[PDB]
Amino acid sequence: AVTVPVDVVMVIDQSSSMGGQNIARLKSAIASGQRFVKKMLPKGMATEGVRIALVSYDHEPHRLSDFTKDTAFLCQKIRALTPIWGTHTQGGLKMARNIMATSTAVDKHIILMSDGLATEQYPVKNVTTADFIGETGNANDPIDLVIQGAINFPTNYVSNNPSTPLTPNYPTHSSKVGRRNLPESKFDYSNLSARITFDGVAGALVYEPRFPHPYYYYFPCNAAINEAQFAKNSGYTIHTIGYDLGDFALANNSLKLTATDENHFFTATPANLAAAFDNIAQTINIGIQRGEVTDF
Ligand SMILES: [Ca+2]
Ligand SMILES: [Ca+2]
C-alpha cells in the first residue's frame, strides 16, 4: 500500500477568548490537538511519510515546532498553549507559509483553528486609498458585515483608546476597509510580531487617520483571507475550524473564506471539536492513498 508523503502545519489561535470563563475552549483544543497528532503519527518517529509542524498565535505568531514526527514534543507544546491577548491570524498563516516553504512533501496541508475575529495584521507598504474597498452589496461578505457591525457598535469594532484624547473617525456605509486581494508585495513582513495600530490599539477595524472622508480602516479578517490566498496559490490545502463562533456571521464567514473551499471549513464547539479533527485526518489520509505496488 503506497501513500505519498504529507506535511501538515497546525496553526492554533490562543487568544484570550480561549481562557477565563471560556476555558473549555482551550481544554478541548488541547485534547483534540493531541488526538490529531497521535492519529497522524501512529508510529511516532517511525511513521513513514508524515510530518507535523506547529504554530500558535495571539497578538504574534509562535513557532512551536518545525516539521517533526516527535509525538511527545508536539503534544507537550500543545499542552502548553496559553490564552494571550490579540488575534493575529495573518501572522499565524504567514508563519505557516514560512514553515511550509521548506517542504518537499507531495501533499501539503495547513489546519487553521480560530475562535474569533482577527484583530491584528501586518502593515501595508506604500499604502494608498486603492488598498481599501467599500461595501460589495453581498450582505454575507466580511466587508459588508464588518461595516454594518461597526455602524451598530462603533467602539467595539473600531480601534479606539479612551486613555488618550486622540479619537478616530467612525465608519458609515460609505467607508472603505482593507482589501483581501492585495499582492504579497504589499505587506511588511520584516517583523512577524508587528501590528497596525491607531492610538496605540488595534481592533476588528483599525483606523487609518492619514486618509480623508469617507474614512479608511485596516480590516484584519480580510488581511487573514489575503494571507490564506498566498498559501493556497503555493499549492497548500487549508482546512479551517471556526471554533465556538456562536452564530456571529462576520467571524464565521471570515474564517470560512480562509479555507480551500466551503467543504474544508468546519463549525465546531468544544464538545464536538474532536470530530472535526477526525474528519480532517480522514480527508488527508484518503487523499494520500496511491494504491498498491503490483507491477508483476
Ligand atoms: Ca479569540
Ligand atoms: Ca484616545
Numbering used by the authors: 138 to 433
Wording from the paper:
However, no phase information could be obtained so a shorter construct, Mfa5138–435, encompassing only the predicted vWF domain was crystallized. One single rectangular crystal diffracting to 1.85 Å in space group P21 and with one molecule in the asymmetric unit was obtained. A highly redundant dataset was collected, and the structure was solved using sulfur SAD. The structure was refined to final Rwork and Rfree of 13 and 18%. The structure obtained from Mfa5138–435, that will be referred to as Mfa5D1, is folded into a vWF domain consisting of a typical Rossman fold comprising a six-stranded β-sheet surrounded by three helices on each side. This globular domain, which has a wrench-like form, has the dimensions 44 Å × 52 Å × 79 Å and includes the MIDAS motif, which is a central feature for interaction with various targets. In the Mfa5 MIDAS site, the five residues coordinating the metal ion are situated on the wrench head on top of the β-sheet. Mfa5 has a classical MIDAS motif36 in which the side chain oxygens of Ser152, Ser154, and Thr224 coordinate the metal directly and the side chains of Asp150 and Asp252 coordinate the metal via a water molecule. One of the loops in the ARM2 domain coordinates the second metal in the structure. Based on the coordination distances (average 2.4 Å), this metal has been modeled as a calcium ion.
